[PDB]
Amino acid sequence: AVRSHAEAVQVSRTIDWMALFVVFFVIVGSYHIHAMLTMGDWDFWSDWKDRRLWVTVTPIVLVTFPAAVQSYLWERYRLPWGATVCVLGLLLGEWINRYFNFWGWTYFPINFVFPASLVPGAIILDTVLMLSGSYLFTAIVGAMGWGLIFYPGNWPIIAPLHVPVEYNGMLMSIADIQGYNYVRTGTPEYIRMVEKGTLRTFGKDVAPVSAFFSAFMSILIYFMWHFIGRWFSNERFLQST
Partner 1 sequence: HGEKSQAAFMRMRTIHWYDLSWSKEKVKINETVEIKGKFHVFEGWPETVDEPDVAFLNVGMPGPVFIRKESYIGGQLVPRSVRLEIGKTYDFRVVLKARRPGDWHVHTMMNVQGGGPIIGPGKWITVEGSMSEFRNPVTTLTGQTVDLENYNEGNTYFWHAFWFAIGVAWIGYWSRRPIFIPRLLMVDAGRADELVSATDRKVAMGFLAATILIVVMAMSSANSKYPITIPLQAGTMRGMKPLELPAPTVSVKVEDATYRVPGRAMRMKLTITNHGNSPIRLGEFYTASVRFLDSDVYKDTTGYPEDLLAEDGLSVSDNSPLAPGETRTVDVTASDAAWEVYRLSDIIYDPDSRFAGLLFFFDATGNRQVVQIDAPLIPSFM
Partner 2 sequence: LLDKKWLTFALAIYTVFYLWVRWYEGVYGWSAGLDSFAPEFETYWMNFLYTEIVLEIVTASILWGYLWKTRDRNLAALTPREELRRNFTHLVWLVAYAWAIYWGASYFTEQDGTWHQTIVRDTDFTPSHIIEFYLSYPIYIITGFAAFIYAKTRLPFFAKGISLPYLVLVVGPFMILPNVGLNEWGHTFWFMEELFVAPLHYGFVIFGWLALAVMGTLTQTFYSFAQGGLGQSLCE
Ligand X SMILES: CCCCCCCCCC(=O)OC[C@H](COP(=O)(O)OCC[N+](C)(C)C)OC(=O)CCCCCCCCC
Ligand Y SMILES: CCCCCCCCCCCC(=O)OC[C@H](COP(=O)(O)OCC[N+](C)(C)C)OC(=O)CCCCCCCCCCC
| C-beta of 92 vs 172, nearer to ligand HXG | 92
State how far the Cα of 123 lies from the Cα of 121, in Å rounded to an integer.
5
Give the nearest distance from C-beta 68 to ligand D10 in angstroms: 10
Give the nearest distance from C-beta 236 to ligand HXG in angstroms: 29
Binding mask of the shown chain, residues 179 to 208, with x at each position contacting partner 2 by CB under 8 A: -----xxxx---x------xxxxxx-xx--
The interface partner of residue 145, options being ligand Y, ligand HXG, partner 2, none and the CB cut-off 5 to 8 Å by kind, is ligand Y
Q: 150 and 58 in contact (C-beta within 8 Å)?
A: yes
Give the nearest distance from C-beta 175 to ligand HXG in angstroms: 24
Burial tier of 141 (Cβ tally within 10 Å: 0-12, 13-18, 19+): middle
| C-beta of 59 vs 145, nearer to ligand HXG | 59
Distances in whole angstroms, Cα of residue 137 to Cα of each of 21, 37, 88: 30, 29, 23
The interface partner of residue 209, options being ligand D10, partner 1, ligand Y, none and the CB cut-off 5 to 8 Å by kind, is ligand Y
Give the dihedral of Cα atoms 178, 182, 185, 188; nearest 10 deg: 20
Binding status of residue 68 toward ligand X by CB under 6 A = no
Binding status of residue 237 toward ligand D10 by CB under 6 A = no
Q: 56 and 215 in contact (C-beta within 8 Å)?
A: no
Q: Which residues from 212-241 bind ligand X, rule CB under 6 A?
A: 236, 238-241
Strands 170-173 and 164-167 come out as antiparallel
